[PDB]
């Protein structure tokens, strides 16, 4: 408990806020919110605000359903770009049924349920550190995004330099001012691609920070006449954007993944987690990569993962074990992209790891022989398997796997499947200019 | 009694107002007003101002009739956008005959008469909460509205964001400053469509707040180079604008619609009100949807009601029962649009509910089987009936129903019928560009 009701009232009085954005996240990952004046703040703190819960279902909503808006006090953040006519503050809210029960269709509530299951098994917390990457594009005269990148930088290069501009520096400075724990910030391989690293927090706090980071980055980029995009693969032939997740599991003693007497200084819990993560990777690939464009990133030659394998040092492994040990022991999943919903991805990953721990599965031997060297047939003999190549195949794999369904819940699973099938059907029947360029003149 | 004459004089002296707009509402719903200097304010408070009452009849006025302008002290509001050369204040006024009798053709007086009948039957107040939705369009170079929306938002989406603009945020702030009880404000399904919710007040106060809200929203949108429209269906293939009414009936004990021992925690009074509302819905559909464009909104597939049925959770029911209970028990009618006259709509709805209570009618069973699934014939076997598909059919239904005529009064009924028949004839004989696009070349 970081803040209380009285603290929130005092903050609202002293910082002179007149608007509060009670925000939440739908199934598709879009940040939505209800806006209330400061005069209603007391009612908001009484968990008495009603709204339409069907919006959580996204565009596949059918029937209006009334739901409560239980806010979280610890998520109180005051925005700085609010001029002087009253400031704006936000609090991430939980969704509750009218019968005082958390909504099963809320991704945050689902993540809380999965964390409760993990605590039941014996662990304390699930620390996560994300590595989101984003692209910056120049705006047009009509304030519309173009295809021109802001700079032709390189990997870890000092490309933006000093003397103005350097949108990454301004973004990180305002994030630090807003109260974000930023570890580092650097230029990525692709031109105009930047990465900012976070500190390791709890699962829920990390997901909330991810959403707030996306919002703040987009707003600040728009301030400087730029468009910040988190599309997995905005351009062809260039490196994509990833959101590598470094996860660690903790218990009463300390880090559960660390064991000085184990092989690679890894505990049996870490190996069981690896086995669970690798066994069901084909299952949750759809959740971790929920867009059509996402699977355009999962292609060989751009450091994105393409095969289900783990290693300590390899060219684009699905799961990577960083060399750091002790309390910093962690497992990195590299298949996640910034377009994914953080809550759903964390829920499915935690469910897979928990299932692996419960079943005590033995992970396959790590591969370090450049699996890209052989053909598909030459590596299918071993345990190396391909990730789904399209969103439809990933959806089929979701519909087959049961543990991921249990980790998502029936409501979320059904609505996610419906929306993604609609998306796939919409993309399949479209006629793209590629087809015209390839066949209009030839045929 | 919130204000007295001395209070009004003190306010006029201290805020330095030089103009007072004595305003009222005609049959068609247009806000009209007579403008007087502050020096006449005393006379205005003596109920001695004469004006032409025929303006209430709208364009179908024939003979000039002198009428008094009894103002309401509790409606004193000082506008903020008045510069320094004297401020402007308004008071909603009642219309009285020269023989010191309220005018029967005034919608506000008619609503007061219906409320008197309700109090005679035994109830105390009729609380109403409206949910108006409006569209925002960009203005042209000549300050003329265009067909381009201000933003491509979504349902409950954080589309306008921070960093300037956000007309909705500016509007609700000025409404709060002016002394409005705003519950919440969010983005609607259609792009450029916004919804601001009110607190539940009395019928007359709610209608006055609706009119003032329309005026203030239009003025503020014009301030920021935008056009705010309350047309039920400005664009084809996009969600329309509605003004759902959440009504509750109160008595000496408390909420008359709440009963912990009843089915669905609803009292017999609530069921009688439902039966009355559903029985005469075909009758007052004309009053609740008085424009030609209104029936363009009442089409399937856009969440607008199309069949006479009630449910607690269904895709677009005519009457919806929110899950909230206790003092918040209420019935929601969703067929009302922002173009309707609030006073006439409340009068006819109250008359229908009162008739249902007096006759003790049994409401039909709620439908939850997606009535849209069957055809018209397959659902006409049950109690499900279609709403009128055009304004002419609704006018015929008005001319048939007698209870709605009694609730409207002879003067208002005759003038409304005349104006609406003129409107229907004007629309019927017009030649639209649709017809030319469909037949000019073919035939």
């Amino acid at each position: 408990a970081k803040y209380t009701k009285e603290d929130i009232f005092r903050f609202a009085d002293e910082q002179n806020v007149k608007f509060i954005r009670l925000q939440f996240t739908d199934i598709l990952g879009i940040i939505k919110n209800v806006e209330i004046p400061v005069s209603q703040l007391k009612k908001a703190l009484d968990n008495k605000i009603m709204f339409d819960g069907s919006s959580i279902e996204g565009f596949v909503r059918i029937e209006e359903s009334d739901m409560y808006l239980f806010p979280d006090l610890d998520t109180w953040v005051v925005f700085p770009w609010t001029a002087e006519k009253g400031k704006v503050a936000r609090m991430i809210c939980d969704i509750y049924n009218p019968d005082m029960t958390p909504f099963a269709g809320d991704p945050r509530a689902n993540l809380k349920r999965v964390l409760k299951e993990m605590e039941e098994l014996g662990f304390t917390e699930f620390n996560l550190g994300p590595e989101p990457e984003f692209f910056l594009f120049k705006l047009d005269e009509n304030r519309r995004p173009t295809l021109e990148l802001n700079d032709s930088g390189g990997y870890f290069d000092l490309a933006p330099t000093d003397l103005g501009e350097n949108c990454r520096r301004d973004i990180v400075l305002e994030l630090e001012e807003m109260g974000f724990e930023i570890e580092a910030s650097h230029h990525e391989v692709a031109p105009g691609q930047h990465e900012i690293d976070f500190k390791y927090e709890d699962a829920i706090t990390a997901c909330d920070s991810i959403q707030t980071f996306k919002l703040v980055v987009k707003t600040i980029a728009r301030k400087h006449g730029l468009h910040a995009t988190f599309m997995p693969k905005p351009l062809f032939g260039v490196n994509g954007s990833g959101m590598h997740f470094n996860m660690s599991l903790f218990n009463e003693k300390g880090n559960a993944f660390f064991d000085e007497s184990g092989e690679l200084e890894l505990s049996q819990t870490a190996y069981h987690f690896l086995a669970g993560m690798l066994k069901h990777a084909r299952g949750y690939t759809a959740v971790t990569n929920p867009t059509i464009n996402s699977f355009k990133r999962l292609v060989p030659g751009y450091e994105a993962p393409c095969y289900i394998a783990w290693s300590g040092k390899n060219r684009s492994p699905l799961v990577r074990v960083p060399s750091s040990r002790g309390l910093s022991t962690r497992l990195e999943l590299r298949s996640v992209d910034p377009s994914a919903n953080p809550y759903l991805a964390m829920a499915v990953l935690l469910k897979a790891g928990l299932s692996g721990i419960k079943d005590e599965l033995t992970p396959p031997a790590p591969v370090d022989r450049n699996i890209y060297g052989m053909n598909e047939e030459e590596r299918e003999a071993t345990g190396i398997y391909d990730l789904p190549e399209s969103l439809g195949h990933a959806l089929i794999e979701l519909e087959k796997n049961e543990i991921i369904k249990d980790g998502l819940g029936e409501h979320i699973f059904e609505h996610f499947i419906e929306a993604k099938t609609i998306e796939c059907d919409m993309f399949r029947t479209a006629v793209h200019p590629w087809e015209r360029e390839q066949y209009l003149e030839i045929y | 009694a919130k204000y007295t004459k001395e209070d009004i004089f003190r306010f006029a002296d201290e805020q330095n107002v030089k103009f007072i707009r004595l305003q009222f509402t005609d049959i068609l719903g247009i806000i009209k007003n007579v403008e007087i200097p502050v020096s006449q304010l005393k006379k205005a408070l003596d109920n001695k101002i004469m004006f032409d009452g025929s303006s209430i009849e709208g364009f179908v006025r024939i003979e000039e009739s002198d009428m008094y302008l009894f103002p309401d002290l509790d409606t004193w509001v000082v506008f903020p956008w008045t510069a320094e050369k004297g401020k402007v204040a308004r008071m909603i006024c009642d219309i009285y005959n020269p023989d010191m009798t309220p005018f029967a053709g005034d919608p506000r007086a008619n609503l007061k008469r219906v409320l008197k009948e309700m109090e005679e039957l035994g109830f105390t107040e009729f609380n109403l909460g409206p949910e108006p939705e409006f569209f925002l369009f960009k203005l042209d170079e000549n300050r003329r509205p265009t067909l381009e929306l201000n933003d491509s938002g979504g349902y409950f989406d954080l589309a306008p964001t921070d960093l300037g603009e956000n007309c909705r945020r500016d509007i609700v702030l000025e409404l709060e400053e002016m002394g409005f009880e705003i519950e919440a404000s969010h983005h609607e399904v259609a792009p450029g469509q916004h919804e601001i919710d009110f607190k539940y007040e009395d019928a007359i106060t709610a209608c006055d707040s609706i009119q003032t809200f329309k005026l203030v929203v239009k003025t503020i949108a014009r301030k920021h180079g935008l056009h705010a429209t309350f047309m039920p269906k400005p664009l084809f293939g996009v969600n329309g604008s509605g003004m759902h009414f959440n009504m509750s009936l109160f008595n000496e004990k408390g909420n008359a619609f709440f009963d912990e021992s009843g089915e669905l925690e609803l009292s017999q009074t609530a069921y009688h009100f439902l039966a009355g509302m559903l029985k005469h819905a075909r009758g007052y559909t004309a009053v609740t949807n008085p424009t030609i464009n209104s029936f363009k909104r009442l089409v399937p597939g856009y969440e607008a009601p199309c069949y006479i049925a009630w449910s607690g959770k269904n895709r677009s029911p005519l009457v919806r029962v929110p899950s909230s209970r206790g003092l918040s028990t209420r019935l929601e009618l969703r067929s009302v649009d922002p173009s309707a006259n609030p006073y006439l709509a409340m009068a006819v709805l109250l008359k229908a509910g009162l008739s249902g209570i007096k006759d003790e009618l049994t409401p039909p069973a709620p439908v939850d089987r997606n009535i849209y699934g069957m055809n018209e014939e397959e659902r006409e076997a049950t109690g499900i009936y279609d709403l009128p598909e055009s304004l002419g059919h609704a006018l015929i239904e008005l001319e048939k129903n007698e209870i709605i005529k009694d609730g409207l009064g002879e003067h208002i009924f005759e003038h409304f019928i005349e104006a609406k028949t003129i409107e229907c004839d004007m629309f019927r004989t017009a030649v639209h560009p649709w017809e030319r696009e469909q037949y000019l070349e073919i035939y």
Partner: peptide, 5 residues
């Protein structure tokens, strides 16, 4: 249900 299609 289907405002995207």
């Amino acid at each position: 249900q289907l405002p995207r299609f």
